[PDB]
Amino acid sequence: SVEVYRQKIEKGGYSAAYEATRRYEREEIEVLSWSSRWESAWSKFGEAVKALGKIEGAPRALVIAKVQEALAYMSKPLPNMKLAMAAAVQAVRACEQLPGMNRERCLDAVAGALGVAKDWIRREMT
Amino acid sequence: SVEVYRQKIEKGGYSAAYEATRRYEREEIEVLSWSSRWESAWSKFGEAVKALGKIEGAPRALVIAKVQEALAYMSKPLPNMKLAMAAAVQAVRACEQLPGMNRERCLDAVAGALGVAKDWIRREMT
Amino acid sequence: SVEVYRQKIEKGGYSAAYEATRRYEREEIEVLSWSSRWESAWSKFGEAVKALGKIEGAPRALVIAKVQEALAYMSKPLPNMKLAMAAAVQAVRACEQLPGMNRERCLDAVAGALGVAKDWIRREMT
Amino acid sequence: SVEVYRQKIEKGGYSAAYEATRRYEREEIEVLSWSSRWESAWSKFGEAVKALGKIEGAPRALVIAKVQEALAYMSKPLPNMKLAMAAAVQAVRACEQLPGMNRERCLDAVAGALGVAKDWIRREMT
Amino acid sequence: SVEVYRQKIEKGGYSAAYEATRRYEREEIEVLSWSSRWESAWSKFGEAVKALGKIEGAPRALVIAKVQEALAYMSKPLPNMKLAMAAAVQAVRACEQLPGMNRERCLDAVAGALGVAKDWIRREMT
Amino acid sequence: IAETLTEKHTLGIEKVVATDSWRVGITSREKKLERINISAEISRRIQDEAIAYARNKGIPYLPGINGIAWKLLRLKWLGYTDQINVVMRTVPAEWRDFLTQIMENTQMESMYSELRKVR
Amino acid sequence: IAETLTEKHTLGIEKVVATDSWRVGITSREKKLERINISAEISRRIQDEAIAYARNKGIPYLPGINGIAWKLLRLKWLGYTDQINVVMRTVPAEWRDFLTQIMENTQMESMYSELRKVR
Amino acid sequence: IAETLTEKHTLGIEKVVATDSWRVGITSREKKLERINISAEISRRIQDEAIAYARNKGIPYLPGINGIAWKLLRLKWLGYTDQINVVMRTVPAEWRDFLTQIMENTQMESMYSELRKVR
Amino acid sequence: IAETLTEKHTLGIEKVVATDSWRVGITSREKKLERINISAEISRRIQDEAIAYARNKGIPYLPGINGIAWKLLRLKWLGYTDQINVVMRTVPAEWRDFLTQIMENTQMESMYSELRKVR
Amino acid sequence: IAETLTEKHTLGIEKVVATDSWRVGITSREKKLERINISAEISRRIQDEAIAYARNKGIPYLPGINGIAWKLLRLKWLGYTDQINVVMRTVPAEWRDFLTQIMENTQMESMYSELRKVR
């Protein structure tokens, strides 16, 4: 829709993004405490999704999203590995359909990114 | 509902949280006296629920809520262990039906988190 | 009723309790003279109810209330031990029906909290 | 008769009930004090009619009317239990002729709605 | 007829509905409280009519009308399932005459719309 | 601005009270209004036969059996026969012969009135 | 800064005098306030028999027997019956009949008036 | 600067007194507030029954039996049934019949009133 | 001066509080907000069956099974079926029949509402 | 400024209410309005034969079969016969003889009434 487009255009974002950029270089803006809390939690998700570089081919969004989903359960204060293996076998089955990928090689990329044994995902596959 | 949603959004909580955060970083806001009374009482509840991490499987909200409930009776100024064991046997029976959990293993987690002897809960189970 | 509820809400109790707390931390509020007379008189009643911790079981509000009524008669400027034993033998009878309590063990807790001899209460039991 | 129908039409009650609705939304009309005496007195009759949900079948208006008539005698400033049981056993006889309803199951629903002992209704049934 | 057509034409409903729309856009009209009581009570009937989408063929006005009459009895303050099942088996007999519809497939769509077990409508069919 | 079914119901009401279409909706018809008279006629005739039925057999008069006897009169006119068959099991035993009296044993007087009313 | 029970009583008062919640705690109820009326009645009804009982027996009127006769009326309502027995041994001998006159011989007048006040 | 749970509780309070979300949190729902009314009703239903139970048996009225009977009324609705049995061993002997009277012998009134409170 | 992801997150916040784009991001949509209403409807539909399923079987109400049954309704809509098979081994035995009741035995009501929410 | 079809629909409506072209659009014709009379006459005659048909064969009256039979009358007048052949299979079996009765067996009365309307 264009009506939702025009209401954010009149708010003047291009000028306002340039002011806050200039204020940061003149040391008037410090790092907000929301951002320092953000990079501590997110840093484990960013390096774990870069470990799926060797998966080739098609739209790999489903393989990427389920590895990000399964890692979130293991990082809970009370980790649920039963639900963590649930999203993982969705990533193994979605990786298996791509041209050039084997069921054994998708078990290499998924279990390497999560950092668990290969047989832990092979148990729930059936 | 939307009309209850819109009435909190028009109060402008995103900016008001951002300005309140900046005031703390510029040393203009001290720790409230309600917060100091909060963390002294709640610190015993937070670590007692992190000890249920080895219980695996299903929605464990009923196991978690009853251990928080049963510990509150022991922390009253006149503690009642009779009503404390009443909610505790609800935590054991709800734990038994999850897949992978035994009756003896649920007695380890419940009596371990409460910090009491295992034979106390077994008396009231029947 | 909600109408008696709504009228106390519009007085702004949550915000004004926050402002008076902040004034205390910035040394603008001293201890009111009503509070200094209160804690001196009430300190004998606060430690007498905490000595009823070993009475176990049921709703013990009647055993707790009758001890506080019995202690109040002894602390008048002209103490009446006869009416103090009147509510005290009600506290022994109310304690006696709880599961796990004997007539001798309730006589221990009531006479220990009031700080009198046991044979004083046994006279008026009959 | 359409004559009496017409003379209520020309009074314009559709427009009038719309306008008095708009006055209530604009806070120009408060709750009449006749209404406050109504719902304080009627609410025991409304929630007792809802207790007959398990009476099944035919026109149940006679069962509803006589269990309402039975509460009216118990709610007087000088209640008459005998005249209340006269209207009560009329509801039982109206209930037992319905298909699927037993005489014993109708004694449950009437005494459950009136909140009395069942044997008081069975004594007058003969 | 034309004379009944004319006397509503001369009222100017085309112009008056135009101003009532513009007054809503200039926020001089709020929503009526009759509308709030309407859409809360109607919405159960709205989506159950959409659950008959796979009934195919003929004029389906009788199947739609008789499944709405069945919901009206179950939604009463005192629900009557037996009078509700009277209108339900009328819709099943109306559905099964349509080309392509089986008597078993009509029991699927009707019990799926009312949200009941299929045996309650099969029993009254006979 | 917005157009949902809640606001569509409201703006249809504002267009009625603005131009006064309810009172001219009734007073312009004046031929359909005589259906109210015939409806009040059949209503009285059903009610008198209920108390006539209740006194010859000594059973107490059952309120709301007028509405059951009127609905099964109208469905017999439409032709919804298995609708009738479930309701005849739902009413008690002694009042069943009254419900077929309204359909069949006053086929003459009562059904001709409904056949005139819808006409 | 600090959190003890003395300042919690102090800071509890400070929100009352700020929001003016004591006066709106009374003037918003207006239904519990008729209990003061019924309480002012039974104080008169107990007192007027207390001077009448003292004049039939020729004994001097004992002040403070009003509150004793009113305490036992409330404890009889709750069921605290052995608190009655120790208090009845505490009063003088000629006034024991007055206390059972308040409880039992004024059952219909005095104890029903309590039964409306708690209701 | 810092991020711990103590100041997260503090900074969460600080936005509330800034934007005034507490008073608009109560006044903008205003449909859930009838749950206060049904709650104040059921507690009166239990309390007047609890004193009537205490005078038929001659036992003194035991305060705090209201909260026990209302806790078990809610647990019976959810289904926490061995939570019930250990509390039923905890109360005295003569009051066990009152607790099953609240749960079962006032099923039609009290449990139905709970079912409308959660709706 | 610097350009890392922490400062990119910070300067992204700083322009939002400057140009007020968070509040005009919500108040310019007025179409996505209807999805909150349909979401709050299905959660009420799942919950009332969840307590009804626990009372027919005598099992206590397990909290969080309303959340599991809503996740399985969304994954069934997308087609992630071996995600379903591992969660069905995770829940207890008596609650497995409830989860297929949400997916299939309330296909016509609940899945149609998800189909209208994403639409 | 702008000219699109959404705006072209609006700017046509603004000039209708400005010069009052709707009410003079109806009142200046005064000859086309007699078509509303003739359509109301055919509409009743189809409904009366539908209940006459449903009572002779004992079938329940199917609402909307008078609306179906009217469209088949008008397409028979135009000549869209293969559209008739599909709808004759879509309606149920016992009502097909009614649908050819409105087209053929009242070729005299009903087709003439349509033919005088379109003229």
Q: Six-digit token pair at B9?
A: 């959004």
All partners of chain H with 3 or more CB pairs under 8 angstroms: A, B, C, D, G, I
- Output the CA angle H22-H27-H30, nearest 5 degrees: 130
**Terminus-to-terminus CA distance in chain C, angstroms?**
46
Nearest-angstrom CA–CA distance, F45 and F113: 11
Which residue, B78, B89, B98, is CA-closest to B116? B89
Q: Which residue of chain H has the CA closest to G83?
A: H60
Q: Where are the alpha helices (DSSP H) in chain F?
A: 5-19, 23-27, 35-56, 65-78, 81-90, 96-100, 109-117
Contact with chain C for residue H92, Cβ under 8 A: yes
| Single-letter amino acid, residue G110 | S
Of C16, C31, C93, the CB nearest to G15: C16
- Angular region, B80: left φ>0, alpha ψ -120 to 50, beta rest: beta
Contacts of H13 in chain C (CB under 8 A): 18
CA distance E88 to E121: 7
* Experimental technique for the deposited model: cryo-EM
Q: Are B15 and I19 in contact (CB under 8 A)?
A: no
Distance CA F84, CA B120 (A): 65
Mark C15-40 as b/e (b = at least 16 C-beta within 10 Å): bbbbebbeebeeeebebbeebeeeee
Token pair 């719902």: residue: D39
Cα-atom radius of gyration of chain G, to the nearest Å?
20
Cβ(D107)–Cβ(D121) below 8 Å: yes
- The span from the CA of H103 to the CA of H89, in Å, is 16
Helices (H), ranges, I1-119: 5-19, 21-26, 34-57, 65-78, 81-88, 96-100, 112-118
Rounded (10°) angle between helices B103-114 and B33-49: 150
Cross-chain CB nearest to B82 (options C21, C50, C56): C56
H67 CB-near residues (< 8 Å, 6+ apart): C59
Asked if D53 and E81 come within 8 Å (Cβ–Cβ), the reply is: no
| Helices H / strands E in chain C, number of each | 7, 0
Inter-chain touch J37–E98, beta carbons under 8 Å: no
> Taking CB atoms and an 8 Å limit, are C14 and H23 in contact across chains?
yes
G53/chain H closest Cα distance in angstroms: 30
Q: How far apart are CA F83 and CA F103, in angstroms?
A: 14
Binary contact (B37, G1; C-beta < 8 A): no
Closest CA to C59 of C101, C88, C87: C101
F68 contact partners, CB below 8 Å, separation of at least 6: D58, D59, F87, F91, F99
Write phi, then psi, for B32 (nearest 5 degrees): -70, 150
Breaks (C-N over 2.5 A) in chain G follow: none
To test the contact with chain H by mutation, choose from I22, I51, I53, I94 the residue with the greatest count of H C-beta atoms within 10 A, namely: I51
On whether the CB atoms of residues E65 and E73 are closer than 8 A, the answer is no
Sequence-separated (6 or more) residues with CB below 8 Å from residue G83: C86, C87, C89, C90, G75
The pair phi, psi for residue I16, each rounded to 5°, is -75, -40
Query: Which residue is associated with the tokens 């008056």?
Result: E16
F36: Cβ–Cβ under 8 A, 6 or more apart, which residues?
D1, D2, D5
The pair of structure tokens assigned to C3 is 């109408």
* Structural contact between residues H26 and C9, judged by C-beta atoms closer than 8 angstroms: yes
Identity at E90, one-letter amino acid code: Q
The residues, ordered by sequence, that sit 6+ positions from B24 with a Cβ below 8 Å of its Cβ are: A33, H1, H2, H7, H11
Question: Cβ of C62 and H94 within 8 Å?
Answer: no
Cα dihedral J66, J72, J74, J80 in deg (nearest 10):
170
Residues in chain B within 8 Å Cβ distance of I92: 58, 97-99
Residues of chain C with Cβ-Cβ distance to B82 below 8 Å are 56-57
Searching chain I, which residue's CA lies closest to the CA of residue A4? I28
> HEC profile for chain H?
CCCCHHHHHHHHHHHHHHHCCCHHHHHCCCCCCHHHHHHHHHHHHHHHHHHHHHHHCCCCCCCCHHHHHHHHHHHHHHCCCHHHHHHHCCCCHHHHHHHHHHHCCCHHHHHHHHHHHCC
Tokens of residue I80, six digits = 């992630």
Distance CA C5, CA H29 (A): 14
Residue A4 Ramachandran class (φ > 0 left, ψ -120 to 50 alpha, else beta): alpha
Non-local CB neighbours of B94 within 8 Å, separated by 6+ positions: B62, B63, B66, I60, I62
- Dihedrals phi, psi of B75, to nearest 5 degrees: -100, 5
What range does the domain containing I18 cover? 1-119
E46 in contact with I, Cβ within 8 Å: no
Task: Name which of E34, E102, A23, A31 is nearest B21 in CA terms.
Answer: A31
Residues of chain D contacting residue E77, judged by C-beta atoms under 8 Å apart: 49-50
Tokens of I87: 């969660």
What backbone phi and psi angles, to 5 degrees, belong to G49?
A: -80, -25
List CB contacts (< 8 A) between E81 and chain D.
Answer: 56
CB E113, CB E47: distance < 8 Å: no
How many CB atoms neighbour CB J78 within 10 A? 9
- Contacts of G94-97 spanning 24+ positions with Cβ under 8 A: G94/G57, G94/G59, G95/G62, G95/G65, G97/G53
Give kind and range of the element (H or E) at residue G54: helix G35-56
In eight-state DSSP terms, residue I110 is I
| Closest chain B C-alpha to C17 CA, distance in angstroms | 11
Which residues from B are below 8 Å from I9, CB to CB?
Answer: none
Question: How far apart are the CA of D54 and the nearest CA of chain H, in angstroms?
Answer: 11
Q: How far apart are CA I104 and CA C114, in angstroms?
A: 67
The beta strand positions in B1-126, using DSSP E, are none
The rounded distance, in Å, linking the Cα atoms of E57 and E95 is 10
User: Residue D93: closest CA among chain F residues belongs to which residue?
Assistant: F60
Looking at the complex, does the CB of residue F24 fall below 8 Å from at least one CB of chain D? Answer: no
CA dist C71 and I46 (Å) reads: 55
Q: What is the DSSP letter of C57?
A: S
Q: Phi and psi of D26, rounded to 5°?
A: -95, 20
Check if E104 contacts F (Cβ < 8 Å): no
Put simply, the answer to whether I112 touches E113 (Cβ < 8 Å) is: no
Q: How many Å apart are CA G15 and CA G9, to the nearest integer?
A: 11
Give Cα separations from E113 to E50, E88, F5, H58 (angstroms).
8, 11, 22, 57
The Cα of J52 is separated from the nearest Cα of chain F by a number of Å equal to 10
- DSSP output for chain E: --HHHHHHHTT-HHHHHHHHHHHHHTT--PPPHHHHHHHHHHHHHHHHHGGGTT--SS--HHHHHHHHHHHHHHTSSS--HHHHHHHHHHHHHHHTTSTT--HHHHHHHHHHHHT--THHHHHTT-
Pairwise CB contact (< 8 Å): I1 & A25:
yes
Alpha-carbon distances, residue F40 vs F33, F37, F45, F69, G117 (angstroms): 12, 5, 9, 15, 53
- Asked whether the beta carbons of F82 and E90 are under 8 A apart, the reply is yes
Residue G87: which of G73, G105, G77 has the closest Cα?
Answer: G73
List the chains bordering chain E where 3 or more Cβ pairs fall under 8 Å: D, F, I, J
CA Rg value for chain C: 20
The shortest C-alpha distance from E12 to chain J (Å) reads 7
For helices A81-96 and A103-114, the axis angle rounded to 10 degrees is 140
d(CA D111, CA D54): 13
| Under 8 Å between Cβ of D122 and D107 | yes
The one-letter amino acid code at A69 reads: E
**Residue F64 contacts residue F90 (beta carbons within 8 Å):** no
d(CA I37, CA B1): 5
Q: Would the CB atoms of B56 and A30 count as touching at under 8 Å? A: no
Nearest CA in chain F to J59: F79
Handedness of CA F37, F43, F47, F50 (dihedral sign): positive
Neighbours of G66 (CB within 10 A): 17
Q: Within 13 Å and on the Cβ side, how many CA atoms surround E32?
A: 22
**Which residue in C has a C-alpha nearest to residue G68's C-alpha?**
C83
Chain H residues whose CB is inside 8 A of the I58 CB are 79, 81
Q: Residue B102 half-sphere exposure, CB side, CA atoms within 13 Å?
A: 3
Of the candidates H21, F88, E50, the residue with the CA atom closest to the CA atom of residue I115: E50
DSSP letters, C22-88, are HHHHTT--PPPHHHHHHHHHHHHHHHHHGGGTT--SS--HHHHHHHHHHHHHHTSSS--HHHHHHHH
Distance CA G25, CA C8 (A): 8
Based on C-alpha coordinates, what's the Rg of chain B? 20
Apex CA F59: angle with CA F58 and CA F63, to 5°? 135
Say which DSSP state D51 is in: G
Please tell me the distance from the alpha carbon of residue C31 to that of residue G10, in angstroms, as a whole number: 6
Could you tell me if I60 lies within 8 Å of chain H, comparing CB atoms?
Answer: yes
Reading phi first (left if > 0) and then psi (alpha if -120 to 50, else beta), residue D12 is in left
Report CB contact under 8 Å: J22, E15. Answer: yes
Q: Which residue has the tokens 């019930």?
A: H84
Query: What are the φ/ψ torsions at residue J21 (nearest 5 degrees)?
Result: -95, -15
Q: Where are the domains of chain E?
A: 1-126
Any G CB within 8 A of C67 CB: no
Determine contact, residues G32/C7, Cβ cutoff 8 Å: no
Which chains have at least 3 CB atom pairs separated by less than 8 Å from chain I? A, B, E, H
Torsion angle, alpha carbons of F90, F95, F101, F104, to 10: 20
C-alpha distances in Å from residue A99, one per residue of A106, B72, C46, I28: 12, 58, 77, 43
Cβ burial, residue H86 (10 Å; 0-12/13-18/19+): buried
| Chain F touched by E123 (CB under 8 Å) | no
The conformational region for residue C108 under phi > 0 = left, psi -120 to 50 = alpha, else beta, is alpha
What contacts H97, CB < 8 A, 6 or more positions away?
A: none
Are D56 and D100 spatial neighbours (Cβ–Cβ below 8 Å)? yes
Give the nearest partner residue to H90 out of C10, C12, C57, using CB atoms: C57
With beta carbons less than 8 A apart as the criterion, state whether B14 and I17 touch.
yes
Distance of CA D5 to the CA centre of its chain: 28
Q: Is F37 on the interface with E (CB under 8 A)?
A: no
Rounded to the nearest angstrom, the gap between the alpha carbon of residue F46 and the centroid of all alpha carbons in its chain is 11
Interface test with F, best of E4, E28, E30 (most F CBs within 10 A): E4
Residue of A86, A94, A89, A90 lying closest to A122 (CA atoms): A89
Q: How far is H83 from chain G (nearest CA, A)?
A: 30
- Distance in angstroms (rounded) separating the CA atoms of residues C48 and C64: 9
**Residue I74 amino acid letter:** R
C25 with G1: Cβ contact below 8 A: yes
C-alpha angle with apex I52: I48 to I54, nearest 5 degrees?
120
